[PDB]
Design an enzyme around this catalytic site. Structure first.
Site, PDB file in Angstrom:
ATOM      1  N   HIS B  40       0.801  -1.224   0.000  1.00 51.14           N
ATOM      2  CA  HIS B  40       0.000   0.000   0.000  1.00 51.14           C
ATOM      3  C   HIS B  40       0.837   1.279   0.000  1.00 51.14           C
ATOM      4  O   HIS B  40       0.256   2.362  -0.018  1.00 51.14           O
ATOM      5  CB  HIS B  40      -1.007   0.015   1.162  1.00 51.14           C
ATOM      6  CG  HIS B  40      -0.415   0.164   2.535  1.00 51.14           C
ATOM      7  ND1 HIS B  40      -0.183  -0.913   3.357  1.00 51.14           N
ATOM      8  CD2 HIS B  40      -0.092   1.263   3.259  1.00 51.14           C
ATOM      9  CE1 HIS B  40       0.277  -0.488   4.521  1.00 51.14           C
ATOM     10  NE2 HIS B  40       0.348   0.829   4.486  1.00 51.14           N
ATOM     11  N   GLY B 142       2.749   5.511  10.173  1.00 53.69           N
ATOM     12  CA  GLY B 142       4.095   5.381   9.677  1.00 53.69           C
ATOM     13  C   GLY B 142       4.836   4.138  10.128  1.00 53.69           C
ATOM     14  O   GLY B 142       6.002   3.976   9.760  1.00 53.69           O
ATOM     15  N   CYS B 144       4.070   1.000   9.316  1.00 49.54           N
ATOM     16  CA  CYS B 144       3.953  -0.138   8.419  1.00 49.54           C
ATOM     17  C   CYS B 144       5.323  -0.523   7.865  1.00 49.54           C
ATOM     18  O   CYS B 144       6.209   0.314   7.686  1.00 49.54           O
ATOM     19  CB  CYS B 144       2.978   0.173   7.289  1.00 49.54           C
ATOM     20  SG  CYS B 144       1.267   0.166   7.894  1.00 49.54           S
TER      21      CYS B 144
HETATM   22  C1  LIG Z   1       0.823   1.860   8.129  1.00 50.07           C
HETATM   23  O1  LIG Z   1       1.798   2.767   8.652  1.00 50.07           O
HETATM   24  C2  LIG Z   1      -0.477   1.995   8.927  1.00 50.07           C
HETATM   25  C3  LIG Z   1      -0.330   1.443  10.359  1.00 50.07           C
HETATM   26  C4  LIG Z   1      -1.540   1.873  11.232  1.00 50.07           C
HETATM   27  C5  LIG Z   1      -1.603   3.381  11.357  1.00 50.07           C
HETATM   28  C6  LIG Z   1      -2.366   3.546  12.651  1.00 50.07           C
HETATM   29  N1  LIG Z   1      -1.838   2.400  13.440  1.00 50.07           N
HETATM   30  C7  LIG Z   1      -1.376   1.479  12.577  1.00 50.07           C
HETATM   31  O2  LIG Z   1      -0.892   0.409  12.933  1.00 50.07           O
HETATM   32  N2  LIG Z   1      -1.512   1.253   8.205  1.00 50.07           N
HETATM   33  C8  LIG Z   1      -2.582   1.889   7.723  1.00 50.07           C
HETATM   34  O3  LIG Z   1      -2.768   3.103   7.833  1.00 50.07           O
HETATM   35  C9  LIG Z   1      -3.605   1.020   7.000  1.00 50.07           C
HETATM   36  C10 LIG Z   1      -3.482   1.209   5.489  1.00 50.07           C
HETATM   37  C11 LIG Z   1      -3.910  -0.029   4.695  1.00 50.07           C
HETATM   38  C12 LIG Z   1      -5.074  -0.771   5.339  1.00 50.07           C
HETATM   39  C13 LIG Z   1      -4.320   0.451   3.299  1.00 50.07           C
HETATM   40  N3  LIG Z   1      -4.925   1.440   7.475  1.00 50.07           N
HETATM   41  C14 LIG Z   1      -5.347   1.253   8.726  1.00 50.07           C
HETATM   42  O4  LIG Z   1      -4.635   0.686   9.558  1.00 50.07           O
HETATM   43  O5  LIG Z   1      -6.570   1.738   9.074  1.00 50.07           O
HETATM   44  C15 LIG Z   1      -7.556   0.736   9.341  1.00 50.07           C
HETATM   45  C16 LIG Z   1      -8.727   1.399   9.733  1.00 50.07           C
HETATM   46  C17 LIG Z   1      -9.983   0.882   9.430  1.00 50.07           C
HETATM   47  C18 LIG Z   1     -11.129   1.572   9.826  1.00 50.07           C
HETATM   48  C19 LIG Z   1     -11.035   2.769  10.526  1.00 50.07           C
HETATM   49  C20 LIG Z   1      -9.780   3.286  10.831  1.00 50.07           C
HETATM   50  C21 LIG Z   1      -8.635   2.601  10.432  1.00 50.07           C
END
Ligand SMILES: *[C@H](O)[C@H](C[C@@H]1CCNC1=O)NC(=O)[C@H](CC(C)C)NC(=O)OCc1ccccc1
Ligand SMILES: *[C@H](O)[C@H](C[C@@H]1CCNC1=O)NC(=O)[C@H](CC(C)C)NC(=O)OCc1ccccc1
Lengths: 302, 300
Positions: B40, B142, B144
């Site tokens: 992603h 950040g 990931c």
């Molecule tokens: C990558 O750095 C990030 C890690 C997340 C950021 C917040 N805590 C974490 O561990 N991953 C994402 O931002 C991820 C992106 C892919 C799924 C495209 N999205 C995410 O974790 O959000 C999921 C979510 C679902 C529903 C509501 C809010 C967040």
């Protein structure tokens, strides 16, 4: 929330083993000096009642086996500073990080790199207890393992491991060889004094709860620092210092909750209990997260 | 003493880099001449909402990827996708590459996480793959591309790469082949996990650790059969205990002189009566993120 250690790589690059006779422990190789516990020079029979100055007179540079892995580092000088031995070696460690030696206070936390035969085995967060012990995880051969904090690539070494007390907690020195607490490096019967709860860290954990939306415990009261300190001691809680009030500053500003207001909230918890409720999912008040640890975890500091 | 202890992170720290595509930034794992990272990174903030990854990837060039190792940029000379992981071929080999393997761990197994931001290591802690294939991490924006690993005689076994946080605050990711643990997808959508269960063999290992550490309050004179214990365990949303598990607990039983089924009778009492406000190794709850191996390694 979880206990998060610092990345240990900068310290891993500094660990060596030191042997005298058949006694082997760990040492810390910074520039051209190796630091290690002075009881490396003891025979098992010596440890009961050691005369370290006399034992060192009977040791020459060539009696010290210092190894980085299996590679010997030639000792070219030696000295004793308090409870640590400083072995000057003929090679400067190319992996020496930017570093400081620091003496921490009770309540402060640090990462421990547990080592055996100069080989790192694991890393975990410890807190210096108010009785100057740490609740560590150490086996035979772990002496000379160090505790540290890292700020922006500068490693602040604060602990070197020396001994286990009969209650299973652990005691040691700073990197100048001065014990934390009233302990001595002799295999004698020593007892940790009665411990107390680290008030500044419990307050930090209450702020962390507030930050995450869990705030039932916030009351409408306040207190003076002196009034709080006198009550806290009746509950086996540490009194707060001026320094403690100041290090809670950033969490106080972030949440908008005055430090003395949070103190009054904690006092109510102490006088009336939790009444079945929980904080951050726990019925117990956690006291090994510092205010720095709380902000470190809620921020992305590297 | 007995603590949750992670592996030394130095061998992994030397592999972490930063990968940027447009305005999206995360971490990558640099081994030899390849950088592994979550796919992603190719998404815009808005692509994430509902991406079609093959379509997004065919439209990228090598020069769309900025890989930074410390201050130094590595030039991307090739890219491919393996499931949810992007493999960026760089023109430079990582001199700090350890001996390593890619492994897919089993539910209940533990691993160390090296949390990173902008290619820089931030913290290290121990995690367990939950039976519902989430992990209880500490990860922020950040993070990931942060990886999980185990270390055996200088060989690093990479088992996890971080991708997302669920609404409940637990975390999901993939193995280094890009396949998610669990029924999750790399899309920015709220996703729930299946009901979690407690890892029974780990709770028993931890009870043996409490004994080794001179604590015995929870022991009893009762005994139980394996099947009768599993009936009660299942009732309390605990995972089944297999004969393989009983075998793996062998060394801990011999060290303490407490038959496995005797420790099971102890845990059954704990489940039906509760801890009554007492603690085991300073914990008010039954801990299930120490494997039998974890207990042996730390206790001996
Ligand atoms: C990558 O750095 C990030 C890690 C997340 C950021 C917040 N805590 C974490 O561990 N991953 C994402 O931002 C991820 C992106 C892919 C799924 C495209 N999205 C995410 O974790 O959000 C999921 C979510 C679902 C529903 C509501 C809010 C967040
Ligand atoms: C150094 O590796 C070792 C660390 C101990 C080993 C067991 N767990 C540890 O943390 N330190 C010692 O063995 C230390 C040496 C003295 C010269 C300080 N002695 C010690 O810890 O003894 C404890 C003890 C005292 C009195 C009776 C029985 C044991």
């Amino acid at each position: 929330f979880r206990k998060m250690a610092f990345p240990s790589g900068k310290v891993e690059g500094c660990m060596v083993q030191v042997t005298c006779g058949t006694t082997t422990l760990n040492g810390l190789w910074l520039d051209d000096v190796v630091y290690c516990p002075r009881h490396v020079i003891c025979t098992f029979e010596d440890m009961l009642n050691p005369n370290y100055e006399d034992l060192l007179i009977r040791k020459s540079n060539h009696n010290f086996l210092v190894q980085a892995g299996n590679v010997q580092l030639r000792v070219i000088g030696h000295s004793m500073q308090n409870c640590v031995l400083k072995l000057k070696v003929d090679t400067a460690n190319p992996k020496t990080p930017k570093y400081k030696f620091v003496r921490i206070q009770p309540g402060q936390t640090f990462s421990v790199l547990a080592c055996y035969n100069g080989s790192p085995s694991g890393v975990y967060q410890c807190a210096m207890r108010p009785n100057f012990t740490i609740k560590g995880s150490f086996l035979n051969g772990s002496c000379g393992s160090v505790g540290f904090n890292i700020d922006y690539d500068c490693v602040s070494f604060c602990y070197m491991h020396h001994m286990e007390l009969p209650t299973g907690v652990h005691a040691g020195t700073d990197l100048e060889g001065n014990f934390y607490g009233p302990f001595v490096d002799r295999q004698t019967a020593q007892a940790a004094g009665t411990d107390t709860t680290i008030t500044v860290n419990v307050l930090a954990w209450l702020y962390a709860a507030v930050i995450n939306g869990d705030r039932w415990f916030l009351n409408r009261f306040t207190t003076t620092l002196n009034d709080f300190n006198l009550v806290a001691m009746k509950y086996n809680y540490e009194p707060l210092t001026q320094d403690h009030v100041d290090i809670l500053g950033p969490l106080s500003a972030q949440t908008g909750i005055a430090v003395l207001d949070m103190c009054a909230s904690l006092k109510e918890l102490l006088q009336n209990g939790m009444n079945g409720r929980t904080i951050l999912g726990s019925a117990l008040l956690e006291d090994e997260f510092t205010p720095f640890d709380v902000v470190r975890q809620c921020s992305g500091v590297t």
